[PDB]
TrEMBL record, chain B:
Its EC number is 3.2.1.51. One of its GO terms (biological process) is fucose metabolic process. GO terms for cellular component: lysosome. It comes from the Bacteria. GO terms for molecular function: alpha-L-fucosidase activity. InterPro entries: FUC_metazoa-typ, GH, Glyco_hydro_29, Glyco_hydro_29_N. Belongs to the glycosyl hydrolase 29 family. Keywords: Glycosidase, Hydrolase, Signal. SUPFAM superfamilies: (Trans)glycosidases (SSF51445). This is alpha-L-fucosidase. Alpha-L-fucosidase is responsible for hydrolyzing the alpha-1,6-linked fucose joined to the reducing-end N-acetylglucosamine of the carbohydrate moieties of glycoproteins.
């Protein structure tokens, strides 16, 4: 059993990040895979570079919004499958933002804005590339091109929080020369977090984080024992698409979003919440609504969201409650509460609501809700490690979806 | 019995916007705050002094309703807190003319609705926390209630209807409905009268009764040989009707679209509720849902207004249903997925036979409303079976409830 390296410990403390999809596809507003899935003429699609003005991209506003939502890092698409680069590739390619009307290195603006807000900037990079003929016609030269594009990101922007490698949809059993790619990154960015969405045996010793599906039930895989500890991360997009998709109406509820964030922490993973920017780089109004709601929850949950860790304490039969541990406190995360009415106005939260947990062995002095500081009544059986709390319902006018009670030990 | 013409017009409205706005909105902890949080009445009622309506724009509200595909708006003219959003002409000092706003907000509302061709409806609470008449002199309370409705009848031109909230009352009491409703008929013969305690109906003059969102089957239209009464369901976006800043428990936009579709399926109208801010703005969160709902209702316009339930059921294990207009049937199809390509599998790609029982006429063509794609189908006319291949959504889109129009031979 190994402990995480410092940089990975810092990663796990980040808790929540914002994922941002923005590319030429954003102009179409029919999903980021539009070029392949809608079988578009490549030449015609790539003309979208000519109208890429970034007229409404404001990295400062984006970093401010991330800070307000309680995110501690942002993963930006620096190049997606379409193969267009949002930064100055310094001669590697003409299909980049410096050859577009915007004439701005957007990654430079992004990194500066993240630093001002104390956020870690992370760079998403797609390894499956539809633009360069090298990908199909000269794979070894493709690897050189890929590696050079990452090298620019390693050398021109100062210290980088990390890299988010999307290795899906690739040729099977191809040699990707990961030792050389990740070795290069270690050389110029020793402190960078390397995230892989095909990191599972790990695909390379240098991988720091592996991605997992958001529905994963139990605590995630941290690597083979006595080997390097690897962290985990789940992702959620607000509708069915990652890039903006105007007529995708199938948005998840804000409630499900909050439950997914809580769930990530419960299984010992970070969570990225994704937004797709408009063609010109604005946060769309729908995404703002979700960020405002999530922000209210994460501000309330701040005592536990960053430092809280899974612990072997389970909830009683038939509840979805769980516990997170910090060094000073335990926190009960309680679901399926209702609002409290009054007298003959019954909203469902009114009755005594005993919620039990097994695995707490220390005597407790006080338990209180984070949102209003109400003190809860409880009983313990120290021998069996049972805690039962009366989990009162929400004050009329409020509903937190996931309610957190802080335990103060004697 | 078949609906009277004003009720038929009501059923064609399909979708309305419900708007909760009162003094409670300044608190942003739900519209029942005065009772449920056991406030001192005097202290709560000081909220009149800061009721500026500084951001209330009836034109913006009517425009938003038009854009979302709503055909009427129900505005709270007086809620349980008992404060009136219009000039009561001396009936009460607890009204907007005694607030800094100094505007008859109902007048602005009615003008804005007419401009956009929307019907204005007035919600009126009958359980009132402000006037001591309610408990101390019930007969005088009835007169006060009736007078407050009379002002709404006589001062604003023709009104689309009244939405009476009769919940939480004293159960035994004689409310003198024939007189109250009778007065409305005299002033506003064509007004729709909606009652949320309309159920035997509570009075012959009731036109519409309310029902729970979750009602599974087609709603109750009144006893045979009796006046037909329409139905209406309501949905609020979170758990509260007035604005509630720390209520994060919003329903998904998908559930909102499904609820709208469901209401039509059971032969009811649907109200989607928004709570305004203290100063009368539509909050940003509500704007998002309206824009998403608006995209769906624009696509569904051929069926959303005139479509009616019909005895055609869907096959085992699906939630699909059919709506009938005089020229077409429409298949409303749920649980579809997005179509990928080649090795990119999103779940909607395979042939997806969806069947219906009760279609007896030969069909010429079936096509999706969103993109005009023609669907393949087979029929067994003797058993009245229709089976369509319900293709999945084009990548980049997802309508939640997809609608196919049937064109008959
Ligand atoms: C993060 C998401 O997952 C990757 O596999 C991509 O294929 C998607 O377009 C999106 O970037
Ligand atoms: C639509 C709802 O109707 C009544 O039941 C009121 O008690 C609520 O506050 C709300 O106005």
């Amino acid at each position: 059993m190994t402990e995480p390296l410092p940089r990975i410990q810092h990663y796990e403390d980040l808790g929540l990040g914002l994922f941002i999809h923005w590319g030429l596809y954003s102009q179409m507003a029919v999903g980021e895979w539009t070029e392949l899935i809608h079988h578009r003429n490549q030449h015609d699609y790539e003309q979208l570079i000519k109208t890429f003005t970034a007229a409404q991209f404001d990295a400062k506003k984006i970093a401010h919004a991330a800070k307000a939502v309680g995110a501690k890092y942002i993963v930006l698409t620096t190049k997606h499958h379409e193969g267009f680069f949002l930064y100055d590739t310094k001669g590697l390619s003409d299909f980049d933002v410096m050859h577009a009307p915007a004439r701005r290195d957007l990654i430079a603006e992004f990194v500066a804005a993240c630093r001002e807000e104390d956020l870690l900037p992370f760079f998403y990079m797609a390894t499956y590339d539809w633009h360069t003929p090298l990908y199909d016609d000269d794979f070894p030269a493709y690897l050189t091109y890929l590696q050079k594009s990452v090298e620019v990101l390693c050398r021109n922007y100062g210290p980088v929080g990390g890299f988010w490698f999307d290795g899906n949809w690739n040729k099977k059993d191809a040699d990707w020369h990961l030792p050389e790619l990740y070795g290069m990154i270690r050389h110029y960015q020793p402190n960078a977090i390397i995230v892989s969405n095909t990191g599972l045996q790990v695909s390379d010793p240098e991988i720091d984080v592996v991605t997992y599906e958001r529905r994963t039930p139990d605590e995630i895989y941290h690597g083979a024992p006595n080997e390097k500890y690897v962290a985990g991360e789940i992702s959620i997009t607000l509708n069915q698409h990652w890039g903006i998709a105007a007529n995708d109406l199938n948005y998840k509820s804000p409630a499900e979003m909050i439950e997914t964030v809580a769930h990530a922490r419960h299984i010992g993973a970070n969570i990225l919440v994704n937004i797709g920017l408009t063609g010109t780089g604005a946060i769309p109004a729908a995404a703002q609504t979700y960020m405002h709601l999530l922000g209210r929850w994460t501000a309330m949950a701040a005592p536990v969201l960053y430092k809280g860790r899974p612990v072997p304490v389970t909830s009683a039969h038939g509840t979805r409650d769980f516990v997170l541990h910090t060094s000073k406190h335990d926190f009960l995360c309680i679901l399926d509460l209702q609002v409290v009415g009054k007298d003959n106005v019954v909203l469902g939260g009114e009755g005594v609501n005993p919620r039990s947990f097994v695995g707490i062995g220390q005597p407790i002095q006080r338990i209180h809700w984070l949102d209003n500081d109400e003190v809860l009544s409880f009983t313990q059986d120290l021998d069996k490690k049972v805690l039962t709390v009366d989990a009162t319902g929400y004050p009329y006018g409020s509903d937190w979806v996931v309610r957190i009670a802080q335990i103060d030990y004697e």
